[PDB]
Amino acid sequence: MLGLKTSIIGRRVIYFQEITSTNEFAKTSYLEEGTVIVADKQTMGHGALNRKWESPEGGLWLSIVLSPKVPQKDLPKIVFLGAVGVVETLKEFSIDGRIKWPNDVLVNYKAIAGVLVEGKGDKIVLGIGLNVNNKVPNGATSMKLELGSEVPLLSVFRSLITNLDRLYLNFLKNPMDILNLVRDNMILGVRVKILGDGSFEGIAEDIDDFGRLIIRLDSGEVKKVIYGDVSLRFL
Amino acid sequence: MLGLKTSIIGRRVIYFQEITSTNEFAKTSYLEEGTVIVADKQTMESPEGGLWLSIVLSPKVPQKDLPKIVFLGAVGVVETLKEFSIDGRIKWPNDVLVNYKAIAGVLVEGKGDKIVLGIGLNVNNKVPNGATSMKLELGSEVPLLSVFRSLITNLDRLYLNFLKNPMDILNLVRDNMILGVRVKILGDGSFEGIAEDIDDFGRLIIRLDSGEVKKVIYGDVSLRFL
């Protein structure tokens, strides 16, 4: 009854009034490629680095099952499809989102969405959490706060699924393309600090052909940061 | 993202751009009670524009009451049609007509612990000769999702009350069914008479011209209006 016209993502959609985690369900259940798992609220949701995700009613919480037949080295870039898809959807609603490498989307430096990718067998699960009408933590934002009006949640879902399907179909053919979209929609030219062991600071210059963040330290040294188990802060 | 607030029916919803049959998927798959299977179209064809869904139910009521599940679907559809100002009436015991034109059909299949309630309703889809749709009745396209929300809400209320008071559904059927007219019952041969009412078991009571009264149990018979 939803009348989705996408080719792969959205062929099937499993909606839950409540769920522990859309990503966990997607990982442990046999689902055909393109299946979208979406819930009104998550009781045990999280994002990258297992950062607890408050997923109250009003937000868009979903996961997508993908099994891309692309070279092994390209498989990691799936996370960027999510970030770019969110940026494209936000633009349709007149909101300018920018990517905080590698998994977050900010609006005027305020967090509005997060992406996470996990694996189970040969299946890849792309998880996305977008603040729409839900209440958000101080410092964060939502489509509702940015527009000063409630936003039809289903309309956001339709828009995002449409954008993700388009990006995914092209990814299967031209997998290097997504990096260019990320590059043009990410926050660069500013100082950042990579947290954790061997912590360092420098200017986030760009991302390379592997999606690694290229940072120029004040000494002139150039470091390439792999995305995945990385924590970054804007200075 | 749908924000359904129902108690059981609609706790989960599995949507398909296309499927062979929502009833077959529901019967075959491991699904929890209340899960709704809905598709834009069924290939084995229920065309795009219609509301094609199946609901997984596990009612813990006496076996003598289970035959009444089909009525939950028929009444639910009638209530939704009335919400859209369409006069749907029940053709005993599983069809809904508008001025004698088919607009919806209900199909229940079960094996005890799992009963599948299937419903097909013509909304914006093209329909066969003699049938009608919500779009044809209202004169314009009807938001399919709005019909879905309305129906799911009605079915959930009807189902929850049925679990506690299985007899209540019968009065809603009587109040919304086509009666007082001649019908032909086809099965082991056939007979004709006036459809008088439904009894406490949901059986159709027919008065033959001879005065004989027959009680029809659905399962291996078909009803035809004359």
Side-chain angles (χ1 to χ4, degrees):
Chain A
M1 56 90 181
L2 291 178
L4 304 188
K5 301 282 72 180
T6 47
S7 301
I8 290 181
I9 299 182
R11 280 197 54 191
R12 292 188 187 180
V13 177
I14 303 186
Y15 156 81
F16 291 76
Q17 284 185 19
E18 178 183 297
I19 201 171
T20 50
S21 159
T22 58
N23 247 47
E24 281 303 303
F25 184 80
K27 292 165 57 184
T28 67
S29 312
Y30 179 73
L31 306 166
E32 61 171 52
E33 174 174 57
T35 299
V36 178
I37 304 298
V38 63
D40 291 323
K41 70 170 66 176
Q42 301 186 97
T43 59
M44 292 177 72
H46 69 105
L49 309 179
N50 270 56
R51 181 166 176 288
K52 180 172 179 56
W53 267 15
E54 265 304 311
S55 307
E57 296 191 302
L60 189 61
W61 322 112
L62 60 78
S63 297
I64 306 166
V65 176
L66 305 169
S67 196
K69 298 303 178 182
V70 302
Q72 177 61 55
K73 60 86 173 184
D74 293 300
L75 293 177
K77 291 178 290 188
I78 293 298
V79 61
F80 300 122
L81 297 178
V84 172
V86 167
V87 171
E88 298 182 333
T89 284
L90 288 176
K91 188 175 184 55
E92 286 172 32
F93 285 73
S94 300
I95 294 175
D96 290 318
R98 300 181 70 193
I99 301 172
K100 171 180 182 291
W101 184 92
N103 296 31
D104 299 303
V105 182
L106 318 179
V107 179
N108 301 314
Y109 277 100
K110 286 195 166 188
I112 200 175
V115 181
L116 172 63
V117 178
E118 299 184 67
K120 172 65 192 306
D122 272 298
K123 166 172 59 184
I124 292 180
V125 179
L126 169 60
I128 301 172
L130 171 64
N131 298 323
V132 183
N133 302 309
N134 53 300
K135 295 198 173 307
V136 303
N138 305 298
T141 190
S142 69
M143 296 185 73
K144 181 180 179 181
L145 293 172
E146 292 302 314
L147 302 173
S149 177
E150 196 97 343
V151 181
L153 195 53
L154 181 55
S155 67
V156 182
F157 176 86
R158 292 178 184 284
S159 167
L160 183 58
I161 295 307
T162 290
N163 287 321
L164 291 176
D165 187 64
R166 189 179 61 254
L167 291 168
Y168 186 61
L169 266 61
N170 187 55
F171 176 75
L172 294 176
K173 299 179 181 300
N174 306 298
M176 297 301 276
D177 284 17
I178 187 62
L179 294 181
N180 305 316
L181 291 181
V182 170
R183 182 174 296 107
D184 303 323
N185 289 291
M186 72 186 313
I187 302 171
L188 295 171
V190 299
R191 200 177 182 75
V192 300
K193 181 179 178 177
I194 298 302
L195 310 182
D197 186 47
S199 181
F200 63 99
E201 311 182 318
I203 296 298
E205 301 291 344
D206 185 25
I207 44 161
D208 62 17
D209 62 311
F210 279 79
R212 296 181 290 189
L213 187 64
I214 304 303
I215 297 175
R216 176 189 190 286
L217 288 71
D218 296 337
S219 68
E221 170 176 20
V222 174
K223 285 184 160 294
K224 305 181 187 180
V225 189
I226 304 293
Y227 55 88
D229 198 46
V230 181
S231 182
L232 174 160
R233 168 194 302 155
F234 286 113
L235 298 177
Chain B
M1 87 284 212
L2 293 180
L4 305 187
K5 300 297 180 182
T6 49
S7 295
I8 296 175
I9 297 180
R11 284 191 66 187
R12 291 188 186 184
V13 177
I14 304 179
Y15 156 82
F16 298 73
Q17 285 190 23
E18 64 175 292
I19 197 177
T20 294
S21 159
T22 59
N23 257 36
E24 293 308 321
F25 183 87
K27 291 161 58 186
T28 305
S29 307
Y30 287 116
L31 304 164
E32 307 201 322
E33 176 176 53
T35 291
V36 181
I37 304 301
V38 61
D40 292 321
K41 65 179 179 185
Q42 303 186 103
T43 63
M44 276 227 56
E45 176 197 302
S46 300
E48 283 187 51
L51 188 60
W52 321 113
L53 61 80
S54 295
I55 304 165
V56 176
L57 304 170
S58 303
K60 303 308 174 187
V61 300
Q63 274 238 142
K64 115 259 214 228
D65 289 304
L66 296 156
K68 290 180 293 186
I69 297 175
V70 64
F71 296 139
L72 297 174
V75 170
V77 171
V78 169
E79 297 185 334
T80 285
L81 290 175
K82 288 172 64 64
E83 284 177 35
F84 284 84
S85 293
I86 294 172
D87 193 1
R89 304 178 65 196
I90 302 171
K91 164 174 172 281
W92 185 88
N94 66 321
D95 293 323
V96 181
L97 317 178
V98 178
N99 295 318
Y100 282 94
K101 295 181 257 79
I103 199 173
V106 182
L107 178 62
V108 179
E109 304 184 68
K111 291 305 166 189
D113 176 284
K114 173 157 74 172
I115 302 301
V116 175
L117 172 60
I119 299 174
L121 166 66
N122 299 322
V123 184
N124 302 311
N125 53 298
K126 296 184 181 181
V127 304
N129 162 239
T132 191
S133 73
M134 292 182 77
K135 177 179 180 178
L136 286 169
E137 291 304 317
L138 297 175
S140 61
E141 180 175 298
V142 183
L144 195 53
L145 179 61
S146 295
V147 180
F148 174 86
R149 291 179 185 285
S150 168
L151 182 58
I152 291 306
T153 293
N154 285 323
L155 293 171
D156 190 62
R157 180 182 63 259
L158 291 165
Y159 185 59
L160 270 293
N161 190 58
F162 174 75
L163 295 177
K164 296 159 56 182
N165 309 297
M167 299 303 281
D168 290 2
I169 188 61
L170 297 181
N171 299 78
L172 298 179
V173 175
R174 297 199 181 89
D175 287 6
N176 292 290
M177 72 184 315
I178 302 170
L179 296 169
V181 299
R182 198 180 185 71
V183 300
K184 179 183 295 176
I185 302 300
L186 302 176
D188 181 57
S190 74
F191 66 87
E192 290 174 42
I194 296 297
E196 302 290 353
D197 183 32
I198 52 165
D199 65 15
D200 60 316
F201 282 79
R203 295 187 287 189
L204 188 64
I205 305 301
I206 305 294
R207 177 186 188 287
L208 288 66
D209 291 338
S210 72
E212 175 184 7
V213 174
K214 296 186 93 75
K215 307 184 184 180
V216 190
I217 296 179
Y218 191 66
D220 231 301
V221 300
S222 60
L223 179 158
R224 203 134 134 190
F225 285 111
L226 302 176

